[PDB]
């Protein structure tokens, strides 16, 4: 066998964290049009048979809180896990409405020893966020 | 026994250290290009190949426009980071 077993009772969960409005004090500007992405992703993963859950404008605390809980759930009858992060960010960092969260932190909740229900199953993280401030000028 | 960091896939919208583009009415370049390729190919291609399609689309069909010279005519390339152990098919 060389391909992931996708015949489990269910394709799995698809968590979409869509942050559009940040606290004034963070200095972070609103991410317009992000609702279009979240609506699109929701419809696409629905037809792929994933149980989708949209969460909007979560604080750093809630983001971690959500990941912690999603990991403690039982994924025995689920084939895979998908997490989509739509927000501001920097290298290895994604912004909660009230402040930054380092990726590694929420990623660890799903690694081998931690989320044994997903062990051996594909954990996919789709991230729409900045990774710094460099601009690509292109060529030709 | 297998690595704890294994079976992970990070599909980033942009390359390491770079900005990422989002359009106010159309959505981010990455997401609208990802959903389009999933719809057309989820039932035909392996996942690593689909994302590659998404790379070509974002890289090819998008270019920023702005009155601010510093941000005008900028390109973007998504970054796939795989630590998967097998091929992934949604069917």
């Amino acid at each position: 066998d060389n391909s992931y077993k996708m015949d489990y009772p269910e394709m799995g969960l698809c968590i979409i964290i869509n942050n559009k409005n940040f606290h004034k004090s963070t200095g972070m500007t609103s991410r317009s049009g992000t609702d279009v992405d979240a609506a699109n992703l929701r419809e696409t993963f629905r037809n792929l048979k994933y149980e989708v859950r949209n969460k909007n404008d979560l604080t750093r605390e809630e983001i971690v809180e959500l990941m912690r809980d999603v990991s403690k759930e039982d994924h025995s009858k689920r084939s895979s896990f998908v997490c989509v992060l739509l927000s501001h960010g920097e290298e290895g960092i994604i912004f909660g409405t009230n402040g930054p969260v380092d990726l590694k932190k929420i990623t660890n909740f799903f690694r081998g020893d931690r989320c044994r229900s997903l062990t051996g199953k594909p954990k996919l993280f789709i991230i729409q966020a900045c990774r710094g401030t460099e601009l690509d000028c292109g060529i030709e | 026994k297998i690595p704890v960091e294994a079976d992970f896939l990070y599909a980033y919208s942009t390359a390491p250290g770079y900005y990422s583009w989002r359009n106010s009415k159309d959505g981010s370049w990455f997401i609208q290009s990802l959903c389009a390729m999933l719809k057309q190919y989820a039932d035909k291609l392996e996942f690593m190949h689909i994302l590659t399609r998404v790379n070509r689309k974002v890289a090819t069909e998008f270019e920023s426009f702005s009155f601010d010279a510093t941000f005008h005519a900028k390109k973007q390339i998504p970054c796939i980071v795989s630590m998967l152990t097998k091929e992934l098919y949604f069917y």
């Binding site: 500007t29 991410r31 049009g33 927000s87 501001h88 900045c130 | 900005y19 583009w21 920023s64």
Partner: peptide, 4 residues
């Protein structure tokens, strides 16, 4: 167009 805007940046993230």
């Amino acid at each position: 167009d805007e940046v993230x």
